[PDB]
Amino acid sequence: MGDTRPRFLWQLKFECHFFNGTERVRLLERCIYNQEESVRFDSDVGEYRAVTELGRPDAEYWNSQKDLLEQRRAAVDTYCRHNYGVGESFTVQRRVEPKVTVYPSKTQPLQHHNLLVCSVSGFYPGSIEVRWFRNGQEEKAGVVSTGLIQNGDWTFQTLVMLETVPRSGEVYTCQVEHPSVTSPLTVEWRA
Amino acid sequence: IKEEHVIIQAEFYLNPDQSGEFMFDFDGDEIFHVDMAKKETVWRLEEFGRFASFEAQGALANIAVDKANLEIMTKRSNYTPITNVPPEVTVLTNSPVELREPNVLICFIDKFTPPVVNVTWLRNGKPVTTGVSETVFLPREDHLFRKFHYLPFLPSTEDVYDCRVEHWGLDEPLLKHWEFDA
């Protein structure tokens, strides 16, 4: 990008970790210089700790401020639990149903090898179960999955492909289970 | 990780570009960020802004403090610069492609730093800027960044597309290609 001048980066991250809804909460405040974490505050520790030498002046300076320390100790309640509650309805409780299609990867003739694609797109959250069936028998052996793909727009997609040698009269079925639907989605492809 | 969720308030300042960022992340997805030029809260999806609000002035004041901290830490490290880490680039569609039915190309940019990148969409080698949208730099546990760019398009057998990414860690601009396969 033309500009060869040196760059200097400072990052500040407040991580709120939640377990069992809000039954257990941990706050991790991290300062990162360039690509190295320098100093952190771990709510399980209760005070700032230096990760590298560069961060030692800050930790000690911050640990001498009792107001800052008490505020950070209470931030699991005033900061973490509050923001969880604020966004609960459209984050934790977000449910978007997947769209499932089945199609052959290539128009390769019959009695020859083919990749059948089960496309599962537009869903949230990430947990999902995709299974292939030949004439009602579960196929676990030739299943090639792209894994979970984050689209960046609060939807996921995944491509689960089955290696097959399709013969006439065979029926292939892709079954998808996801929290947004109570009963599975099933799409079939006829050979 | 089944019962666990993570909310991250991630912000940064970069010199000498004088670039700042402030955003909230939930399980890896952006809830909102603050546009510094417009001084405004930008929700990642519109519906979010109908359940929640945010006072953006706090974000701006945070960024000012981050700037002062960035200059102090730079001096304290004997002016140690960051080492460029070049990005990985992937191009996908967001749904199965059907000829002449609207779709979206996704350009996923991952595992890079510093958070400065130049992205261009090319259709048949020509820059395309119509309907495009993009995310800010998203945080990663390894303290690198992610980014998404989007291009709505009408699939056809006649067009090829490239996502061109420039970054100081690359020897040359990187082009990732997409085509319909008949």
């Binding site: 300076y61 900061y79 | 109908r50 929640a52 945010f54 706090g58 102090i72």
Partner: peptide, 15 residues
Amino acid sequence: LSYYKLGASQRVAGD
């Protein structure tokens, strides 16, 4: 509407 609470950025040591 409920508001997100800000994590206040603090000043580092030195000058």
